[PDB]
């Protein structure tokens, strides 16, 4: 006689890592030949990248993001999901996040022309669908890039604020903002901030709401031209 | 010199059983610690019970449903599918229908703040994949588990109202149509109701063609903050 | 270990493409059926046209223009754009501007009463919409058409004044106009004609910026009771 027993669905993901140590560590590694071409690469195949790495079996994948090259923890395939990626792991998310991290604080410790540099190349799809572009401020446009949410402090509380905007208006699912609510602003956690610094996500979420800009590119004879 | 003889192909498995008197025994029996965490228990991993039996040799296999605990017949097994199971027996079939006649009994007796815990708890996966939820009706939502099909009266045609609206859709094949057609709405067997109560299974279509409901659950402070 | 590369976005559909010589084989092959009646169904429809060749999968499809028929290639289906279409080839885009050249020297090679059943029967959707209907000239009305970019030289730039018209005031974005770039006027390539005839360009967009015209038509005692 055989007996087996059988139980209740996941609590999904939560925080298994430390996010400004492994935002650290991706800092250090990675962005030491990183640049505006490779960002915007990572960003605009980010449909693309987040389909071949949940196609590929393999639990290390390296992206190839122009000369830049950084490896992956692919949590991404099926079966990959629910084997914990370490403390100071990468992911597709947590990649995505650690390059919006990244360029946050380029966007307010750069020059303004090559802030200017920023803003042609890199082009956030999850941004632009809902409108925003750079123009709106940096720290709104970059925190629709997913992984932004595991770091509130330096955005200050726009992930959440997006989070929240998504779900109200009837486009994304109430659980995935349980993930959010496990990660940090500044060095406080979950329940502390939820309250604390809730007028923080309510400023966040007006301003996120309305926004939009646009740009176009190519061609040089022809930018000219119809400039006129 | 050897001679050895070849056949047609079979006609399915028919009722074999009275489906109201092993609803009884099954109630009588099983129903008696048989909880809603048990219940949804059940439902949720409806998917690997399936496959679990089938994975098992064994002819009597129990099921560990949280605390509660079924003896099932297995017939999902391959070797096991054509030994005919008694006119008490469970099965896997004949339990989630067992469960779903027990539940729309339970949703049409109970108190509208308990029927709100099943309509958390119990969580239908051929019910959801389709829309349906709780919302839509208890009797519609119940019908899409298997086993259902074997007690028409009950739900009032809606198994097989169910059963027509994916073969149409070209989701099911019409061969499983065959097994119902041979079960009893009320005390009525297959040919009386099929044209006297032809009226019912049309409304009863009519009915489950549209509907859709959602919920999300799980976190404390999480919820409390997101709602707002 | 795997290694996986992403890159850039696009550079849009550049002239794959004789354009002069693709209205000649068009001009030859189609033309030979081909009346007003059936003209003015596929610029009528060309709003369902455009849409029924991009649900379709085919690569060719015929066009059945009330008895006169076209072969098409069809570049409209997700799928099927980015596949090469011959020097020769005849796309939606294609098609519609080599209509408009077929007219526009009709228009300028047919007795002025034959013009008056070409100016009945044909109605442009992208003319209508932006007021501009046949009396304003025959060459401003059919450079609405798109595929009439291709050939500059005939219209005498009207198809980009239309197009810088369009983009000035919002209504189409800057990078079509890309497209129109990479065409001739006369045979002139891109870059010479540019500025060499700026000014062609010039008095072309300040006669399509303000002209409009209306029609009405069908019923016969009803129309001749209405008049008086």
Do not use: C
Request: glycine share 6%; proline share 4%.
């Amino acid at each position: 006689m055989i007996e087996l027993e059988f139980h209740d669905v996941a609590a999904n993901t939560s925080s298994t890592f430390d996010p400004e140590v492994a935002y650290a560590n991706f800092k250090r590694v990675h962005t030491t030949g990183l640049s505006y071409d490779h960002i915007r690469i990572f960003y605009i195949k980010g449909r693309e990248i987040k389909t071949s790495l949940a196609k590929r079996s393999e639990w290390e994948v390296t992206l190839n993001l122009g000369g830049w090259k950084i490896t992956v923890y692919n949590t991404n395939f099926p079966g990959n999901r629910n084997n914990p990626v370490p403390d100071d792991g990468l992911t597709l998310h947590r990649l995505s996040g650690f390059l919006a991290r990244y360029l946050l604080e380029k966007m307010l410790k750069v020059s303004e022309p090559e802030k200017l540099i920023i803003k042609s190349k890199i082009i956030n799809p999850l941004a632009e669908k809902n409108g925003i572009t750079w123009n709106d401020g940096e720290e709104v446009y970059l925190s629709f890039f997913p992984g932004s949410e595991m770091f509130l402090g330096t955005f200050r509380f726009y992930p959440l604020a997006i989070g929240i905007y998504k779900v109200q208006r009837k486009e994304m699912e109430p659980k995935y903002l349980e993930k959010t609510m496990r990660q940090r602003y500044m060095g406080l956690e979950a329940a502390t901030w939820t309250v604390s610094k809730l007028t923080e996500v309510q400023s966040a979420l007006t301003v996120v709401s309305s926004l939009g800009w646009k740009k176009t590119n190519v061609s040089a004879a022809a930018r000219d031209f119809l400039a006129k």
